């Protein structure tokens, strides 16, 4: 609940800054808004690729760290050291 709520708020914010303006050059609009043009399943899938260090996801560092801590706690509970 908390993770997806903060993710949704930050995604709305990122949307706002994405379509503020590109007066310098507007050729990058397609790549900048392909995120918001992808359907929700792929949206969450690519928002959730901060595992490992590929780091192509637009997820911010604090939101990444929250799940990185929750996953370690869950693995400790599951008994995977």
């Amino acid at each position: 609940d908390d993770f997806v709520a903060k993710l949704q708020d930050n995604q709305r914010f990122r949307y706002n800054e994405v379509m503020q303006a590109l007066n310098m050059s507007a050729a990058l609009t397609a790549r900048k808004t392909k995120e918001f043009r992808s359907p929700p399943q792929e949206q969450i899938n690519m928002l959730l690729n901060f595992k490992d260090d590929k780091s192509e996801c637009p997820c911010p560092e604090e939101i990444r760290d929250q799940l990185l801590d929750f996953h370690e706690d869950l693995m400790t509970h599951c008994g995977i050291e």
Binding site: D1, V4, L7, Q8, D9, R37, P39
Partner: peptide, 19 residues
């Protein structure tokens, strides 16, 4: 164009669906 804009981004979806 219009098709992908008329697709609501993840933030518009109700929170339980996002969960």
């Amino acid at each position: 164009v219009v098709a992908c804009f008329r697709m609501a981004p993840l933030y518009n979806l109700p929170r339980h669906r996002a969960v």
